Design an enzyme around this catalytic site. Structure first.
Site, PDB file in Angstrom:
ATOM      1  N   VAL A  42      49.784  19.513 106.418  1.00  0.00           N
ATOM      2  CA  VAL A  42      48.936  18.410 105.987  1.00  0.00           C
ATOM      3  C   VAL A  42      49.506  17.104 106.523  1.00  0.00           C
ATOM      4  O   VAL A  42      50.686  16.799 106.317  1.00  0.00           O
ATOM      5  CB  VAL A  42      48.820  18.368 104.459  1.00  0.00           C
ATOM      6  CG1 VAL A  42      47.869  17.273 104.040  1.00  0.00           C
ATOM      7  CG2 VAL A  42      48.357  19.713 103.933  1.00  0.00           C
ATOM      8  N   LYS A  43      48.671  16.333 107.211  1.00  0.00           N
ATOM      9  CA  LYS A  43      49.039  14.997 107.652  1.00  0.00           C
ATOM     10  C   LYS A  43      48.509  13.979 106.651  1.00  0.00           C
ATOM     11  O   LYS A  43      47.398  14.128 106.137  1.00  0.00           O
ATOM     12  CB  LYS A  43      48.491  14.709 109.051  1.00  0.00           C
ATOM     13  CG  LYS A  43      48.568  15.896 110.002  1.00  0.00           C
ATOM     14  CD  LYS A  43      48.165  15.516 111.423  1.00  0.00           C
ATOM     15  CE  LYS A  43      46.804  14.846 111.493  1.00  0.00           C
ATOM     16  NZ  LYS A  43      45.818  15.487 110.591  1.00  0.00           N
TER      17      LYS A  43
END
Lengths: 220, 220, 220, 220, 220, 220, 220, 220, 220
Positions: free
Chosen positions: H84-85
């Site tokens: 996840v960014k």
């Protein structure tokens, strides 16, 4: 890093013993002449001044290999574990070689050339001592010379170490340490100029002033 | 890398606890004076604010070696593991020496010279804290001073670490970190300017705008 | 070299007029807001603050080309010779071009890019004002940016000059001057830290102490 | 410094004429093909779009020296003072020699080598145009090549000037200008990204925010 | 910037005359022997292949100072304004001295040392010709050698000029020109490699292709 | 550039007069001792081997200022326009100032320090002569020392010039010339190794061999 | 380049007058106090020791701007052409400014910051005197500081000049001169170290030795 | 080294899977918006385009720490191993910290400052993604910023890795890789410009041409 | 370090096998065409001239991945352990991936870009072969490009090695080796110029001449 003092005044040595973590004191017969006192007195008194710990250094005056051999024998008779430093000449290299054969630690002094110091180290001196201030004053560049000597020692003879001396200003000591010197020595005046700064004093004063203006005392 | 906060505001440090991975908070008597509250109150509250974690730092103000010895005894009594920093004078070096003898970790503060910090580290101080902003303001070059101090530490005293303080702009902090500092601390305003960027805000707004124009919502 | 002050307090300006060789005072609407006083009052009083000499700078606030056109007309109506600074947008470039057509000197403010300032200079602004502190705060490099801007000006637009602003420490001003800036302005706090040094104070104190201990007077 | 646009849209040229101090517009058959309209129609159109002032550039398409000679004759017939740019081959050098003999200014395009551009300049060309983006994309170094070409032109043929083209990011234009280029051209997208900054926008926003917070209005 | 050719083929010279702006053609006895034809035949033919304009260079083969004096007399008898190059020996320096006394321009060839070229220039030779490829092949570095030669000529004898020769790749010519050479010469094949680039050819091809795809025609 | 010889052999001087463009010959009492002949003979013979032109140099032997004054009077009596060399001591500076008052050009020799050379130049010496080889042999850096001396002269005393001497290899002369020396002198062995190269000999040999293989002769 | 002496002993000044080309002698109240003699008595004696030539420098002592104004009036009354040095504070700046108003040449002393010296030069001081040794001792870098000060002066205020002082070793003077200082002053012991070299002495000794071995004397 | 793609077109991903050794594909909500397709569709199809291997990246859109908590929960529910960014704000750091507590790998995106990325890495994000093109276009230096970020990571947080994105020309990717980036991602057009060179094509063409000239055919 | 030959002449390979420590011979269809003989005939003969040892290299000619897969199968069928070289296109990358999946070592040829070679190395080629001479002929910098390629390989793909080819002068090979290349191949002419020096020949000549003049024989 090894810290030494190039002086022979017992009172100053004892007083500064509580301040810096001294590893010993190196002396030269010039400083001995300044102190006017005989060595067989100055080394015992200085040894007691430094709490009987640390290293010691003394310098011979003879010109012939066996002459400084006998001188080193006398020094070892006086103090068991002293390191004998010898001026670097042809006789100096000789005296270094037979002294290393006898296993007595030696220091190379009066070094004015990187090649000269490297030769002394190959002959067997555990320490090499260039004269930074004299080399610098005689048109050379003591900082760069120390740099080359350090590079040569690290890249051919790792067990050897550089012992910088002959200082007049804190900047020279700063550059010598930056060059990678494993040991340095300094005189009393330069040492004093190491531990005093008007900026530091003013900062401490303002700091205490703020504490006072806030809480109404000085002590914690 | 160790991150610390250079302040004494309980609410501020508690709020910022969830944002940065805090390693502790360093305080100086000037900031304590600004906070107006006594130490025996501020240290427990701050320790609770870090949830009983992190490091702690306080400074003595005495002039005599035994004086900061007693002060450090008081700080260790109040907080068992707190690190005591001492201003670097001749008495500072002395106090550091017997403090390292008694095994209490120490920090070097009010450092204005690389040689001074090196002397403190040799005496045994675990951390050395120069004043970058003050040095730059007084015509010196704090960045190069910090770099030289770091090089000297990595060369002669591997166990010592540089703890940068006294910051006014994020550029100074970035330069100190690039110089190889193993620990830094910073004030609240510089911390706030660290984590805010109009470019970042505009990029996020444009990004959410793209999601909106694509799917009729800014969600998911 | 041109020296200015970025402030709006009449008393401080008048007091510092006796110390530095002021070439003028620059103001921005943020500083005007801080001073809380209307411009039609602040400019005459300031002009008298350095006694009708020096240069004056004020900024527009309109967004449309004719908007800052009318603004600049108002400033020239109040003070005949004032130089008007305009934010560098597309409307800013249009305004700079047609004001250069009218022959009224202009300044480029809020410059965050060297190419942006170079475009402003080509459009005709006599001065370009980068924001060094803000650029460094936003992850940039104000010193290097000023360097490139200066090189570009000296290369393509010889008549343009760099006017550095937005300072927090004297180090930033020192670097800007070293970069070749022909004009700088600085705030009051940086000016105060600029002309004060504890080292200088200690030196002069020791100096007069020696002369006093010698002859007993305080003057020649 | 000479600023040009490598585009052929009349509306955009006219719109941007009010923003930058345009020195003219350079065109190539590729962007002409993109614009879809014939050269004899478009050329007067953007010629009027620049207000009738500035420079113009168009490229030949033939392969034989007399062929691009005739092309240049047609261009000069259409507009008296246009500069004719020719791709650099053996035929290119021959055509440039002929055209310099005829006294019609010429430009060297499609330059991928510093030596190639230098030869073209020595042949009599007043302008040389390397393709920075293409050279960089093909594993070269456009900035380095531009630097060498600029140095060679300055130190052998002072009358030649470098006209950089083929840009994708403002950084390439920045480095080309820093290299000493006397003229550059840029596309519309690079122009738009050039004169817009979220940081500048936020600074202006904060600016009239504080102005309003002070004076009940964002207006002066 | 003087462009020369180091070749002896009349057809190639005349063909390349239209392309590069020739300043003259240099010849050496080796390449003359390769061309097989006698000098009294070749020099008029090359001079006419020039278009009648340019510089001509030929070399002596004698060992004795008067010997190359007589040789140079023969060359000046054949072509009035030809410049005679002489191999640099002790006899070469002598011959250069009497030739400078008699006012015949001379060139220094077979130069392998920067100091050697300096001595030739001080003796008075108008040009100095190092052998870049041979120097590189024999373990030297012709690029830096030419650099030092140029620096020495500029800073002692401004009237001398460097004429680089002996090329195998365009890179050597590029570095020689970047070093500040005022004149160079160039073999036919490496010169061909100056004026051909697959990237340029592909760019021109794509250029014409898009023109055709847009307008249904190839012509401008 | 001024070329000199440091020798006293009439036959060698006459023989080398035909090769290098001699500007003069410098002599020192050590070389005079080597030649064994008295000065009142050596100077006239060297002057006649000169062809009657060029410069001459001789060095005095006294220690006291009026002493070398009288010696310089004697030398100027023997040869009217000879330049007098004086060692750079305190008495050397005194004698140099006296001779500058007398308007006789003087030579500063035995220069082991850049500051010493600068002091002599201010005193009025037309040339300053460092001992490159000796400074090298004593652990210094002759090349860098010459560089600093040249920089200092070009900065403060434009009329002074550097005359390098004491050479053992052509490399030292090359670096001295590259440093900006306006005059150098060479010994015979270094001069011979200077103008001889096996590479040049082999190139000439191959050259005439190819000429032979082509035309049945090695001649034009 | 202007050479001065920083001392107050008439005998030493007169003795060294014959050796160096003295441009004057600077004095400071510390040295005056060491000499214990009144200024109105000492400086006539120095002026006579000059032979009636050279420049003179003395420092103000009071604190208030008009205080050093009257002090400078007294110094000009006692010696007409003497230059007045002032410590650099806010009061010093005001004193410098209005002293430039009535045209009294001034020198900036006690300079610890390059920007401080630049401000003094802007105020109008003809000379700026940084304290190299003190700055180096206090953790700074006098050499680099002097470099920046010189660059700033040459860039903004060409008419100002740098006058280096505070020397302990020859290297500081050498580096100050290399940095571009137009004038320096020198203490007696360091000056003595500029004019004594064991290498020079040994070279002279061997020189007379070979003259002896040659002609039976070291004479003629 | 880790190679990724910043795109969302299944056909292009599958086609390029046969050419480069793909390590995964990164997607951002802007690219998802461009693709117009919902995430719960694009990630499965892209994973199939992988062949079932490689890494996947997606970004949150919420502004509150629990908001991106829920977003990351949804992404991990959709694909188990996706990284996840999160945009880097105060909420960004809080989120990064608590997902590092939860053991879900995270990436730092929208990084505009080296200090910002370093703070994200300290918070614990496995990857840091600066926006090279945006930073470069906004007057910064993307290459230098990436270099500093890589240096800081290798110095303080060895486990963090730099993931360069936002590319427009192959030069940016080349410099990012040369800076020491352990992972990069690049768009389709720029990747195409990695795998096409006219020089390579011409070499291949000539290669088959000479094979044909040899064997009457272009094949083995 | 691996030394190879880029040639196909059996006699030359056999002759040079005795001189250099050959590690193998690389062949390409260009030199195969030059040798005019079919590969199935030449390569056993070269293997025998090897002494039966060393490495072998050959190239495909197909444009499709499967076609050059079949080519590699044929080559491996003829010679058991030959390494197949493939041009680096998109098809080349695919062929390399499949061939690595088959465990056959591969070389990437016609490499004109550092990124291209790095992509091939990631695809799985054991070696990468740039074309230095063609690169610098086409306006690039072969030495620098090889440097970047080596840096990228040592950084990301330790197992890859650089195999430099395409040489015209020994200087290029020297720089390639200095850049850190683990393998190089050079042509016969460069090899011959490599192991021959007139200086070495003259030194040997003088050497045995002196031996002869000493002992009446040239023998030992």
């Amino acid at each position: 890093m090894e810290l030494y003092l190039d002086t022979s005044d017992v009172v100053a040595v004892k007083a500064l013993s509580r301040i810096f973590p001294l590893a010993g004191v190196t002396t030269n017969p010039s400083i001995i002449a300044a102190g006017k006192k005989p060595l067989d007195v100055v080394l015992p008194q200085l040894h007691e001044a430094m709490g009987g710990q640390g290293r010691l250094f003394a310098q011979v005056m003879a010109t012939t290999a066996e002459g400084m051999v006998n001188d080193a024998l006398k020094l070892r008779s006086i103090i068991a574990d002293i390191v004998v430093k010898v001026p670097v000449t042809a006789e100096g290299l000789a005296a270094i070689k037979m002294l290393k054969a006898e296993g007595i630690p030696t220091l190379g002094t009066a070094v004015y050339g990187a090649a000269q110091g490297l030769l002394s180290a190959l002959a067997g001196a555990e320490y090499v001592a260039p004269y930074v201030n004299r080399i610098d004053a005689q048109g050379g560049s003591g900082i760069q010379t120390v740099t080359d000597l350090h590079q040569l020692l690290k890249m051919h003879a790792p067990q050897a170490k550089v012992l910088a001396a002959s200082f007049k200003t804190p900047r020279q000591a700063l550059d010598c340490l930056l060059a990678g010197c494993e040991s340095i020595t300094l005189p009393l005046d330069v040492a004093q100029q190491m531990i005093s700064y008007p900026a530091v004093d003013a900062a401490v004063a303002k700091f205490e002033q703020d504490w006072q203006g806030a809480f109404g005392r000085t002590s914690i």
